[PDB]
Amino acid sequence: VYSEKELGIPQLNTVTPVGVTKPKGKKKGKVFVDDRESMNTILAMVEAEKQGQIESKIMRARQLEEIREARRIEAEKKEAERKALLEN
Amino acid sequence: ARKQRDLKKFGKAVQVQKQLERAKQKREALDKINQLKRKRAEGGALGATEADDPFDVAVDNELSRD
Amino acid sequence: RTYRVGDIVDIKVNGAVQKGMPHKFYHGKTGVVYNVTKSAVGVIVYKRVKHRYIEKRINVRIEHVKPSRSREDFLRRVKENAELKKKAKAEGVPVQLKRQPAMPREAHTVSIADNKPVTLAPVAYE
Amino acid sequence: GPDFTRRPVKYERFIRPMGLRYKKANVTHPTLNVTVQLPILSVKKNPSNPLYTQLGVLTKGTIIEVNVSDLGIVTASGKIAWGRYAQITNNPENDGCVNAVLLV
């Protein structure tokens, strides 16, 4: 039993996409999550993962809609930031 | 497997050589004290208290004051 | 210094260079060159184990190798015997062409005049 | 040194019992030709084990820092010396005292 991080295993394209892959041994450019909206969406998945199984179907849906609304508000802020960057 | 094979074969030779290194560092540390000991007896030129730098830094600084 | 593959070299192991120095067993050795590189020379040496000799190959740099003259005595003899044999056949007497071990000294007399012997005590007092 | 400290986790197993501790040392001055009992300030260099330096082990040849306030050493610029190097010149494992010579 050894870690996949230590072995030089290539990333494989699955239903979950690989995306753009950064080269090994070079600068993996840091993206910051200082924004409160970007802080809320990460917080929604942490609280959802720890809570686990809920018997209620409605409360199970509200646990997912909180994550969905957090993603939408963050995306609107990022698009407004992208528009402000395009103006500048 | 290659690494464990060489450590299985060298083994005691590393253990003996490590003891000779540790016996050498005791000699070097004791000799460096005696160079300090002869220097202060020949002369000195110090402060009220000893220097805040650790050993092999304060001693090397005193041996660079020559 | 230019070296060729096959000559006889002596390894000295100078302490000025710490690169390419062989073991202390290979210090003060003599072997035959089998490989020549840019900065190192491969020398085949002989090492005895119990009764046989196992040939070992070591890479020694230029700074530790030097030519020898062990063969040079053999080639000095092979011309000296050649000229002597031609010079002997020219006038027609045999000559001992071999080298012989040192023999015991023959009898002789030693005069005592001008060299009167001095008597010596077991320890010197003066 | 101090009465109560919370050691790092890396040193918490190493128990030094209270009956095996020393606070003062018999320290001799090479030039004044006297021996006085001086308090120990810190253990500076154990020349056998680096871990013994961190644990404070007193060993023959170990440099310690002693308070020389009672000795009245007048340094350059007219200052009374207060901390000096001393080399332990005995084996405190075998005898129940610490003997040192000042590195002055």
Place this chain on the structure above:
Amino acid sequence: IPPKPRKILQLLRLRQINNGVFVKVTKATAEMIKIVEPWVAYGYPNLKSV
């Protein structure tokens, strides 16, 4: 016996105890007998002994 004196006793044909050989004295043969001195007794024989 060390390995070097063992070979000289073979080369001098002294393979057994109370065994004797005649040796011409040179500088090459004298140093042979010098090494095997802890094992041999030698000297100059006369006409009778021959």
Place this chain on the structure above:
RNA sequence: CCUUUAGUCCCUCGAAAUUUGAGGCUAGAGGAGAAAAGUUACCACAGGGAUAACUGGCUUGUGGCGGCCAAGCGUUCAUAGCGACGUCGCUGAUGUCGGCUCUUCCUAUCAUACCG
């Protein structure tokens, strides 16, 4: 970018009842780059190596360090140095430990005997 080292006492700012602090010049040393890297007589876990318990003419009543003295010895000998006896200077424990056990021996003798 500053620090240290040795020199010139060759030049500025601050303080100070005439003395200082902070920098400069010369040239040695210290501090491919946000991906990760180097390092430790330290710790935890897992593994490998070496050793495969020890002591047996053992032990007892007189400390250690440093100085002075010191017959000798030494690489020729009181000085390369080693160096004894002295003298001087510094200095309630405890608690898985106890209890019981015939016979015989040791003296390192508490008593009884005899001496100084």
Place this chain on the structure above:
RNA sequence: ACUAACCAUCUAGUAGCUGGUUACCGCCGAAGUUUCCCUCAGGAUAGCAGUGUCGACCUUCAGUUUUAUGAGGUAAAGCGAAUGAACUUUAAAUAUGUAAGAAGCCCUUGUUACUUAACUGAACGUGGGCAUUCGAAUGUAUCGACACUAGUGGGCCAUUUUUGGUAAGCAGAACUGGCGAUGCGGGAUGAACCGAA
């Protein structure tokens, strides 16, 4: 909805493990080791022992001495030689590497796509001779090559040299010797001693 016991047989189930394994005499006779391999409870290779074939032959080989030349210039003597272990004319003790002719040559000349300004050099050879000491000594109860086959692949103690440490112990490295497969004489006795197989 899901997912005990005894009897006979498969079964003489699976072991690298334990124990045992059957006349005599003769001859030859070990190793307890190197190097490599996803190598350490294992394989291959080389060594020691043996068989068969071929090839020789003093044109041989050698845990040896000598000569010549190195690595230790390690002691010593001198400084009425110079200079100052780091000085030397010389040079120990003690072990140690390499070479010593028929495979070397020498004289005449053939090849080469190597080499050189070049019938110049390097390699392999043809023709004559050094075949009687042919180019030190001593020995030699033969030596080399190929193929095949079996057991082996642990160390203990001591001398000498050397490295490190301790209050003293002790720990490591190299050579050699003894014991492991060895009886006999001696040391009253006997793994490690002496003598001698």
